[PDB]
Symmetry: C4
Subunit: 95 residues, 4 copies
């Protein structure tokens, strides 16, 4: 299950890297703003402080959302159940 | 399962076409902006760079969200489990 | 299952009515804008074209989200599986 | 199950407290606006009336979303099934 989580973890990083590179280059965002934008899109928070202005950027975002949500959400759930939950349970039993 | 995914795939396309046509016509968006708006609403990202200004558009959006989320989300999950997952597993075994 | 869906359906209506009344009165929105705002909050689209300006409105929105998401999402899923799905299947068999 | 819900309930409070403190201090929001922002981020509504302006705040928000969504969503579901549902069923049987 550490190997389940590692694969998902890695795939998320690669996914957020892909959005960082595209949005920084095509839409002109600072690298840190691209990442933060990529994270805020794929978790569907969507503040809208950043949003794509070019048509290429709009098209890309369509496909990035559809390809990216299922992964991101899969990692978060794996993180909650296989990492966050056990550490919670462990804190309720003094060793 | 390719036939499960095809039906959902098709139904999503038709759903996004429906929003493209309405928002372009009633709210005046360029076709590409309507589509991008439709995609950003039904995945609940909701940047808000576009949002309906007319009462008809507001009413329509209410019903489009309720009818449209269950489908969109169903396709994304089908896409993740029946397409994205297998291709991931296949990349871990040289043929 | 029509009785499952009816109860949820009703509970959603009552929930959106509650938000319509509060936001129209406390935040001053037109009734139609309150409803549209209530729908856009509880489905977590969150365009932000409307958002509460008063502290009372901010507090209320906190609790409305937590009480309201589980219901709304429950209705949408019931709608997708017990209404939308069957009608889809029925359209693939000429009577 | 009251003990399931209590643990989750508590963990959510602590999570929203953590965001209240950071956003009030680092981003300068009034305590009430930080809380409301924290709640609106972790439920992925994301109105965007508030959004982090500093790079530290942007980085923090990335990790807060990933750590925080799984919890928040877990509480809401526990709330819907173990508290909201039973009280609904109880209202359909006069004692
Ligand atoms: K959302
Ligand atoms: K959102
Ligand atoms: K949003
Ligand atoms: K927004
Ligand atoms: K979900
Ligand atoms: K969601």
């Amino acid at each position: 299950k550490d190997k389940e989580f590692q694969v998902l973890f890695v795939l998320t990083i690669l996914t957020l890297i892909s959005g960082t590179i595209f949005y920084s280059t095509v839409e002109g965002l600072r690298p840190i703003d691209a990442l933060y934008f990529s994270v805020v899109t794929l978790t569907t928070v969507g503040y809208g402080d950043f949003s794509p202005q070019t048509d290429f950027g709009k098209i890309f975002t369509i496909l990035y959302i559809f390809i990216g949500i299922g992964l991101v959400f899969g990692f978060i759930h794996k993180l909650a159940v296989n990492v966050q939950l056990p550490s919670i349970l462990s804190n309720l039993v003094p060793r």
